[PDB]
Known about the structure:
The structure is cut from a larger assembly and holds one copy of chain A and seven copies of chain B.
Chain A: H1 2-13, H2 16-25, H3 39-46, H4 49-57, H5 72-78, H6 82-90, H7 105-112, H8 115-123, H9 138-145, H10 148-154
Helix pairs in contact in A: 1-2, 1-3, 2-4, 3-4, 3-5, 4-6, 5-6, 5-7, 6-8, 7-8, 7-9, 9-10
Chain B: H1 2-6, H2 9-29, E1 42-48, H3 54-67, E2 75-83, E3 87-94, H4 100-112, H5 120-125, E4 127-131, E5 138-144, H6 151-167, E6 172-177, E7 183-188, H7 190-195, H8 200-210, E8 217-219, E9 232-235, H9 243-247, E10 250-253, E11 259-261, E12 266-271, E13 278-281, E14 284-293, H10 299-311, E15 321-328, H11 330-358, H12 362-385, H13 392-423, H14 427-453, H15 461-495, H16 511-534, H17 539-557, E16 571-577, H18 584-601, E17 606-613, E18 624-631, H19 644-655, E19 662-667, E20 679-686, H20 692-707, E21 713-718, E22 724-731, H21 733-739, H22 743-755, E23 757-763, E24 768-775, E25 790-792, E26 798-800, E27 805-812, E28 815-819, E29 824-831, H23 837-849, E30 855-859, H24 861-868, H25 873-892, H26 898-902, H27 905-919, H28 925-954, H29 960-970, H30 972-985, H31 987-991, H32 997-1033
Parallel strand pairs in B: 7-24
Antiparallel strand pairs in B: 1-3, 1-4, 2-3, 2-28, 5-14, 5-15, 6-14, 7-12, 8-9, 10-11, 13-14, 13-17, 16-18, 16-19, 17-18, 20-29, 20-30, 21-29, 22-27, 23-24, 25-26
Helix pairs in contact in B: 2-12, 2-15, 11-12, 11-13, 11-30, 12-13, 12-15, 13-14, 13-15, 13-28, 13-30, 14-15, 14-25, 14-28, 16-29, 17-27, 27-28, 27-32, 28-29, 28-32, 29-32, 30-32
Decane (D10) binds at residues 29, 31, 296, 384-385, 387 of chain B.
Subunit structure (chain C): Homotrimer, with large domains that extend into the periplasm, interacts with AcrA and TolC. AcrA may be required to stably link this protein and TolC. Interacts with AcrZ. Part of the AcrA-AcrB-AcrZ-TolC efflux pump.
Protein name (chain C): Multidrug efflux pump subunit AcrB
Subcellular location (chain C): Cell inner membrane
Amino acid sequence: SDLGKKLLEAARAGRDDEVRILMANGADVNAADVVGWTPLHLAAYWGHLEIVEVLLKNGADVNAYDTLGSTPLHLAAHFGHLEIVEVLLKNGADVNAKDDNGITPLHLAANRGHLEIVEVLLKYGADVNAQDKFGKTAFDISINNGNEDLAEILQ
Amino acid sequence: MPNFFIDRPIFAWVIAIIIMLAGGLAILKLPVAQYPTIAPPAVTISASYPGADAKTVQDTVTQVIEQNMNGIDNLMYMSSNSDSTGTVQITLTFESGTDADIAQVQVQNKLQLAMPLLPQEVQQQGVSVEKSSSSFLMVVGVINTDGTMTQEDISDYVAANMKDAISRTSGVGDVQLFGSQYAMRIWMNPNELNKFQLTPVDVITAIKAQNAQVAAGQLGGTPPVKGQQLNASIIAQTRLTSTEEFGKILLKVNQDGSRVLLRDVAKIELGGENYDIIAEFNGQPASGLGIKLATGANALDTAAAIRAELAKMEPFFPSGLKIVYPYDTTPFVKISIHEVVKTLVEAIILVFLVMYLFLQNFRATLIPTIAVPVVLLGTAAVLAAFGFSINTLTMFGMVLAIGLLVDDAIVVVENVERVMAEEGLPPKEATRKSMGQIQGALVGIAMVLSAVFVPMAFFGGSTGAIYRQFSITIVSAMALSVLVALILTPALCATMLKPIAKGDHGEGKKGFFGWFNRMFEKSTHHYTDSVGGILRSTGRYLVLYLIIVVGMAYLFVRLPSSFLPDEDQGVFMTMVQLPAGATQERTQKVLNEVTHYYLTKEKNNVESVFAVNGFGFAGRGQNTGIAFVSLKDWADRPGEENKVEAITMRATRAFSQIKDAMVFAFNLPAIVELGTATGFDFELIDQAGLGHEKLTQARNQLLAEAAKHPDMLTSVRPNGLEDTPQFKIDIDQEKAQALGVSINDINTTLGAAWGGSYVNDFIDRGRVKKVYVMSEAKYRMLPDDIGDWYVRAADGQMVPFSAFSSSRWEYGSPRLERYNGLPSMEILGQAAPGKSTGEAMELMEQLASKLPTGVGYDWTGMSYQERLSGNQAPSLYAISLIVVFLCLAALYESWSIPFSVMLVVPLGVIGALLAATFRGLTNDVYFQVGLLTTIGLSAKNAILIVEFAKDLMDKEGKGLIEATLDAVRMRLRPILMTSLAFILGVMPLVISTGAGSGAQNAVGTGVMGGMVTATVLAIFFVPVFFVVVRRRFS
Amino acid sequence: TDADIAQVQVQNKLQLAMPLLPQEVQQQGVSVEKSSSSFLMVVGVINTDGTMTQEDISDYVAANMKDAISRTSGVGDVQLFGSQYAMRIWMNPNELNKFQLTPVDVITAIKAQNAQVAAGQLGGTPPVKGQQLNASIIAQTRLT
Amino acid sequence: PGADAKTVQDTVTQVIEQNMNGIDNLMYMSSNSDSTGTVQITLTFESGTDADIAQVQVQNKLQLAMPLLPQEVQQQGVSVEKSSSSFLMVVGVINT
Amino acid sequence: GIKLATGANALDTAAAIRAELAKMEPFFPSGLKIVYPYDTTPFVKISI
Amino acid sequence: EDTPQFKIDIDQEKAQALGVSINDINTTLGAAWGGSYVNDFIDRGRVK
Amino acid sequence: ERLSGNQAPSLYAISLIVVFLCLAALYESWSIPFSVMLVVPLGVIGAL
Amino acid sequence: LGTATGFDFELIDQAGLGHEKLTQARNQLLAEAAKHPDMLTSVRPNGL
Lengths: 155, 1034, 144, 96, 48, 48, 48, 48
Ligand SMILES: CCCCCCCCCCCCCCCCCCCC(=O)O[C@H](COC(=O)CCCCCCCCCCCCCC)COP(=O)(O)OCCN
Ligand SMILES: CC(=O)O[C@H]1C[C@@]2(C)[C@@H](C[C@@H](O)[C@H]3[C@@]4(C)CC[C@@H](O)[C@@H](C)[C@@H]4CC[C@@]32C)/C1=C(\CCC=C(C)C)C(=O)O
Ligand SMILES: CCCCCCCCCCCCO[C@@H]1O[C@H](CO)[C@@H](O[C@H]2O[C@H](CO)[C@@H](O)[C@H](O)[C@H]2O)[C@H](O)[C@H]1O
Ligand SMILES: CCCCCCCCCCCCO[C@@H]1O[C@H](CO)[C@@H](O[C@H]2O[C@H](CO)[C@@H](O)[C@H](O)[C@H]2O)[C@H](O)[C@H]1O
Ligand SMILES: CCCCCCCCCC[N+](C)(C)[O-]
Ligand SMILES: CCCCCCCCCC
């Protein structure tokens, strides 16, 4: 739609004022781009905490996935946006969500080595024994990355 | 010296002839162009990495080259782009005065030593080191009308049969093909390759083996066996020539016996090198040639030669192929020359009319008709010697000089005619006295006018180069005019003019000329009686002077300033920008709608629309395009409503309706390298390896801050492209080693298929051309197609790409900028209405200082030159003043009297500002030089009035008021004759509506309006200025 | 003698030799310079706080200073009193032998896994009719 | 190396020659391609032309052609020098 | 160790180096400082 | 004047059947009949 | 060779005009120059 | 221009003798140069 495109750009940029207006005007919160990213995906990726909260309040799909099956929790967990990861999980984000590769937010958070997020994901009941298409756990990544602190948390 | 040539009229005639011959010779040989070289020397390093993304190109090519641009002479700054098309451009801009050849070879040499550090594929494609030049002489479009040929089919014919001949044409400096010559395209089928257990690696291996030049040797080569009879060259395998031969390339032989060939696993055709651009001319497929003008060549002759060459190529053209001329500057340059020669002739015709109106004899009217052409020709000889070319700036530079050239002729003759009338002296002795009265002033005037115009040339940067063209042109013209006035015209006046009886002012004649003499003689008495009353109450005119000075200063500040006025060139641009991530097809639909509008609703105005899909000045990609609109003849489009600006603004309003596209039209600037006055060019640098995202945020922080000052800064925007979605595909190393698949085979299969791979050369009809292996369209479109590509493992089994790969979406730059070997982000913008650039820049510097730690800034392009060369303006103005004062001080032998002359400046300027502000023109170069010629002539008039008045007080021991009234009486007629002639002479330029009118309007209006005040005011005011000054200091 | 032309004539001849030189000598980059043998000035760089080592200071000077000074007009040559950082792989022969490996395998592996690949584009030109997706493909990149 | 005149002319001579358009003070350009594989494109310039500047202008224009040439030709090398056709002297050497 | 290019002006080149170093100082890490332990231009400037 | 040329034609399909690489063929012909520049050596303190 | 011959007429033409104008200026006359310059053919025939 | 009255001599291997023989030739020259303090002073090689 007309406003759908302006929300995607506004959600990406981080313009809180423009989002508020578009939420009032009635912009589609499930409006995807070409790759299949909702405004929540954009806000989750670029780390805009308020817009993530604003979109979720406006009945935005928290478990919306792209053409490759990656959710906003994947993008938030991978790029180390601790604050956003918590908000998504509270609004009912699937912590064991698998993309087309079988990669969960735990795998991504482990690979970039975001210690604080790994604990939060585990706290909300993340499957630590979860494997990707190559049969790799979050622990398998930590020992291959050589992250001693991360490996100890996964024990 | 006048006395020397009054007794020696033949010596003067010899000098006249020598000058005329030298000038005549110069006009024949002088180069002809639209505009000369103005922008500083720049060297553009360009390369291509087929299939490579922005980052890949940057971190493999751009950074490596940038690091090895060390020990080069007179380098100012170095900018670079690295885009997702696989292209890189590094523009090294040099100091104004640097040898562009030395600058190029120094860059080209330091690159050669960095070539071994670049990737194999980039070394293979090559790196081009060229001198920057956007100024095309003309673009020759080549189109197919019967739809038998594609754009690639046309491009090949142009490359083979036309380009080489157009290159060898007399006066052509460089030629640029719009499109590529044929390439052997192998469109691979992944389902077929997997069926026979093959890969792109095998296809590349097979092509390199079976399409190659093999060395053999000779029969009976030295050292031979003594008694050898025959010595012949052994010819082995050579390069393939046809698609059929590439089809019969053997890949594999099966056990059963049946053979696997390249045609069995791929489609083969003679295609283009790349498919990024889709060129169209009113819907029909199109290519073309970008022709540039050689150094010191003639644009008119070069154009005629190109057309004459294209003409004799037409008989060999295939059925459907036609030549079109969407862009051509020589039509404009033809009119520029004709209109100037028409003005210079009409000027001398009007002098004849004015000379005869007042003096009333044909022996007087000839002397200016002789003297002026002698100077005009002489000027060409001096400019030819200085190495100048016939261009718009030097042409109009002489039109502006007409005022000074016409005066020097009139002043000398009138003064002789006056002395003969008042004293009844014979022509020869009357000329000796006449020249005796003015010779001192004319030598003074030369040094004064020199002091005005010479400093104008000493300006730096692009703007300073334009001023230099007007400066040397006017100084040269004026210099010879004074020289001719002291050599030729005295001799002519002494010989040609007949005697006049003492007291005979032609009041005793009949008819029109009888009435005019009594009319003027009593008008002269009204004028002297008038000045008489003015010189009793001088106080109120010093008040009226301050009203003019405040009037001037007011209008000066509240007149919009520019570099050059926009012209109707017969063409204009129309940008088409779609949302980022859009496809080539989407952009074509918009360009089709844009092309439709112009050929439908603007059918009366528009001739053709060159729809270039894929091209964008501020970044390439599928989601950008340009429509090059070509209009019909200037005569066929009557009224302002059917001119470019009117069509431009109508089109912009129409295309604002278009759904998902930023579409708008804009007229082309006179010179592209300047940009816009009020506009600035700001570079935001990464000074501590912060990365891309951290510089993106810092840019967004500055753009947000700049937006919160609309009163100072407007249209503040990034020049670059925004981050776009990209398909990240991690190759699992363990899974690849486990199945026995090498990383070379994986990265080659992906790179060759999806990106393309330049394998080697082949010879199509005796021309070396490229061979590209790539995936057929339908197997390299969507992420699902990744899994359909199979790589062979060491064990022999075929492994799909899915088995050892994982993919996800991320955001990355499709065009990474750098400035002085550091990551940069160019930000454009302009000063708000009323504000100067200096104010706008000073705020941008303040906002920049409150950005995160590690983020620096710098000024580039027009802003870099404005920061440095702009500061010279007052220091030259100062030097000019001191020299002018010194020159007048020497002339009059008085520190005080010079002031009387220097007070005349505003009288000429006020009129120019009225005419400009009234009409709605700008403070442009044509107007600004237009002032200096109006100031120069008003000063010249005053210098004579003050000299005459002074000489009467010194020699004949007259009173101040007596001498002043006597002086202004004698100088009344020649001032009116010069003005009447010049104002009528420049009148056509003011009312001009047709081609190149914008410049004529700027030149004409700023002179006519200024001359009206300069004449009307100075005749009353210079008397006042002299009296007040002479009283104050004596 | 025109030093600018002297450089051009000398390099013209060096370009004929460059191919005949080893692959290793070319990849270190041959330089043709026209400078006075004696030093104009020495620009010393130190850390007063003692936060950075001799090797750290040298790296910064090479990475964030040297290039711009070398590009400056009149600067014939710039000698770095130090060395720019480089990813050092300090090999252990006892450990290479244990896993049946050599320096060759280490060099081969680095060349394969530390590589910046040209992987093309999705919906790249020439595309199919009715394509809506266009995005650059990113395979392996350089290691940081 | 190991190329015939026909092949050399198509792949090298014509490629270089068609990049030698628009050079300051060029009178004429003679060239030859032989069966040994050699090319020799001699550009004669106007009388009084700065020979060193001429050389630079040619070198610059050649390096646009350089990458379009075959791989073998680039590895062998290409020179751009000021050339006279006749010998000042021949200095013979014999063994008595 | 900066060496003067063939036929270039020592003082003018030295001035340009200081202008380039002056643009780098603001973006230095905490503690880093420029020192001038050798320079031939100060003599040429003062001696004249 | 135009000279005669000895045009030898290598059958790559027939070579593959016998199990010989066309690289070895090209090198064997090229080296033998034309001569091949392998590398350099030192003849009395000079590279040749 | 052809260049030398093609410019020879232009060379004689201007050379005559210059010598004529040079004499015209020096002796302040048109008769003296024209009276002298009629001698040129008497010399040229001797050379031929 | 160099030091007041210093000289820069080059000893050349004109007939491709080798390094060792050029070293011995140099040692012979330095030996004979050493035993003329009245004429020559501090004569030494610049190399290692
Ligand atoms: C490749 C090149 C292309 C071709 C270009 C061609 C260039 C041609 C240049 C040569 C032009 C020469 C023209 C000569 C004109 C002579 C006219 C009079 C001749 C004559 O003998 O009469 C004299 C009196 O004439 C008088 O009345 C003398 C008074 C002053 C006369 C001035 C007016 C003449 C105008 C000449 C210029 C016109 C041509 C412009 C190009 C007597 O002689 P005398 O010795 O008794 O004189 C006394 C002085 N003491
Ligand atoms: C410093 C500077 O910009 O000098 C310029 C500008 C200039 C100083 C002018 C000389 C003189 O009128 C000046 C006076 C005091 C003249 C009287 C008033 O009208 C003043 C409002 C005016 C201010 C500027 C002006 C107009 C200059 C000259 C001298 C040129 C003189 C002649 C005869 C053409 C110059 O440019 O050389
Ligand atoms: C820098 C000097 C300052 C300006 C001095 C005065 C400028 C005005 C005079 C310019 C006239 C001389 O310029 C001369 O114009 C004539 C026009 O017939 C041109 O003559 C040309 O006409 C047409 C134009 O397309 C061609 O097809 C043809 O081949 C040729 O005869 C010359 O190629 C040009 O050199
Ligand atoms: C339309 C605006 C553009 C025009 C710009 C030119 C302005 C000058 C206009 C012409 C002025 C001449 O007009 C002249 O004015 C002066 C006043 O100063 C008059 O002078 C008269 O009044 C003054 C003041 O009371 C007396 O000292 C004087 O004795 C008396 O003759 C003249 O009688 C008249 O002839
Ligand atoms: C340096 C400025 C030149 C000003 C011109 C001076 C000319 C004065 C002539 C005086 N005169 C000799 C005619 O009596
Ligand atoms: C095409 C004309 C070029 C002119 C070169 C310089 C002329 C000098 C004349 C003395």
